[PDB]
């Protein structure tokens, strides 16, 4: 048995402006009882209504996912939220807690590239975006075309990883079809992050043909 | 679990001196290398100095070499940074930091404290 | 149960370039030192097992790591032998077992693309080089950077974990920072990928330069 | 649970012939997973062939094989089937059955592959 607790995405925090934190319980050999999870603060202030989802996995694992909408000001000013998990066949309750990561702040730099054409794929091209020089680790990367955000599934973005003195970095990879670039030859890589200025977003556009 | 609490910030005139104390709690302090990092208004963070586990190895950034002295006392679980010959250029928020793997050099440290403010000006 | 064990496959660099593949068994022990960990190497086939080395070290947080590495036959591995690492410790109720063999399934050679980031304010003595390795499978790959015809240390660069593309093969990104002295010395940096299905000699590479 | 998939039914057939591939499942609850078939012809990049629904209501095919092959499964016998009709020289390949923990209906880098079997279409 294992339990995890997330932080809000920057997209939730700064673009939608309605951050939410998710407590995730992954339960191998399940269904002896019912998992009870309780949201709480360190400060003791009221907690909003939480959603709760139970899903059975293909391998027979049960996952319990609960998500709490949190106050925008409360999180920014360093509030601490705790998820405490009770189940009858668990010996002692599992407790996880979360808060804004302290420490210095650094704006991302965004660079977007287009791979050369390769035989076998002249009706699609691979777009690659590099986001680097930022900290904390939390970042959300987004792709926009004809002024509309693409579905998340269209692209895949690497987990953040250290550079040993330059900040964190991530890469984004997107596959675009010929019809899309014939329609409009502009694809926009946008990063949402705390230390970006002026509106917590920085972006760069790339085009298949210059 | 690593909890780091800075103290000792304040306001001083150019040429003055101020002493920063970072208190450690919740882990075996004597097993970790320690470092100090600062961020001045509207500038990217700058690694300042770092200390060895035993205290034998000291490193300093070129900007602060011979002006600051880092130290630690492992029985009191306290890390220190002694700043002498302060300049307005040194106005920044200062954090103490540590990492599970590498802490001697500049790095994206796993753990940071809460920070404290140092203002060097004519006042 | 507070203890966890992992078992690797040979790297493509060890298997195909160095030509001495090795598999590493890793036991990570929280709240340790109640006893001594004994792990025994075995095969499914039952053939002799080579002599294995052992390294045990304490972590900063007080966790113990026990690492054992076994040299495996080049012929045996390619032709599908199955190796098992069996972990014994006195405070474990039942021994932990992990096993490994080459991943089955179709195979596709990488494509390599190498780029040079634009100049960035703040340093005239460094530039970031970025290499994209994609469209390959299985996941197992080793990525390397060469300058002045010699391989750079592993610490010089950082390479993303392999991740799916939903029908086009796996992909990884590599990031390298090069200094002014190096490119002034020779402005050619080569991104080289080692992979099973790369042909003709299990290698594919692309060169990149700071100044066109 | 450990995923074991064993193909059978390969061989040599004349063009225009037909063949039935049987993939036997063991070590997991077969009735919970979507299934697919993948092939790689000699010296060509791998190509996803077909995929099946959990219950069998959903079938997907690549255009190259559409209307020639028909996929099916029997959940009580823990066995997946691919029925191949009107074979062409284009279809000589090694065939694998596959499945994935997340997505199996479309082409993907599947988590699990079987051992494969060979289909040689020639005179
Ligand atoms: C049977 O099958 C099931 C499969 O479902 C399997 O159960 C899985 O088990 C593992 C662990 O055992 C679980 O993996 C964990 O996943 C946690 C969930 O992370 C998700 O959400 C993260 C947070 O998202 C929120 O916040 C971000 C911003 O913070 C925001 O953008 C979002 O909108 C959202 O609000 C998210 O980061 C994460 O996404 C990344 O990672 C996934 C992983 O592949 C990848 O798909 C994405 O592309 C993306 O890069 C994901 O979406 C996660 O918190 C946790 O990570 C911590 O722990 C590991 C382990 O130490 C650390 O390495 C890591 O640094 C983190 O500290 C961990 O990865 C998995 O989630 C279970 N199931 C499901 C449904 O998720 C069973 O194991 C199988 N059976 C057996 C026997 O194993
Ligand atoms: C107290 O501190 C200690 C130490 O900090 C900490 O202990 C860690 O505990 C976690 C789990 O709890 C361990 O996590 C596992 O790490 C495994 C080790 O992976 C290493 O080796 C891998 C294999 O290398 C061989 O093969 C490759 C080619 O295959 C070849 O190149 C090599 O030469 C070698 O022969 C290798 O893949 C891996 O490298 C990746 O990860 C590092 C992480 O920094 C990254 O830097 C690399 O770039 C690369 O991405 C690494 O070198 C690993 O096998 C294992 O992975 C499984 O689990 C994860 C999560 O479930 C899955 O996502 C994954 O798919 C695997 O199933 C997992 O990551 C960790 O290793 C310990 N650290 C050490 C140093 O031992 C304790 O947790 C701390 N205490 C507390 C209470 O938290």
Author numbering:
A (entry chain A): 336 to 545
B (entry chain D): 2 to 124
C (entry chain B): 334 to 545
D (entry chain C): 1 to 123
Give me lines lifted from the publication on this model:
IgE acts as a key molecule in a network of proteins, including the high-affinity IgE receptor FcεRI, the low-affinity receptor CD23, and galectins, e.g., galectin-32. FcεRI binds to the open and CD23 to the closed conformation of Cε3–4 domains making binding of the two receptors mutually exclusive and preventing overlap of the two pathways. Here we report the crystal structure and structure in solution of the human IgE Fc in complex with the sdab 026, a llama-derived, humanized sdab that was selected against IgE.
After purification of the IgE Fc:026 sdab complex, we obtained crystals that diffracted X-rays to a maximum resolution of 3.4 Å and determined the structure by molecular replacement. The asymmetric unit contains two copies of the 026 sdab and one IgE Fc molecule. During the process of structure determination it became clear that the crystals contained the IgE Fc Cε3–4 fragment and not the IgE Fc Cε2–4 as expected. The 026 sdab binds symmetrically to the IgE Cε3–4 forming a 2:1 complex where each sdab:Fc interaction buries ~800 Å2 upon complex formation. The sdab bridges the Cε3 and Cε4 domains from each ε-chain in the IgE Fc dimer with the Cε3 and the Cε4 domains contributing with 30% and 70%, respectively, of the total buried surface area on IgE Fc. The CDR3 is inserted between the Cε3 and Cε4 domains and contacts several residues in the D–E loop of Cε4. Residues D99 and D110 in the sdab possibly engage in electrostatic interactions with the side chain of IgE K497, and E108 appears to make hydrogen bonds to IgE Fc residues 498–501. In particular, mutation of residues E108, D110 and Y112 in CDR3 abolished IgE binding suggesting a critical role in the interaction and supporting that the contribution of CDR3 to the interaction is essential.
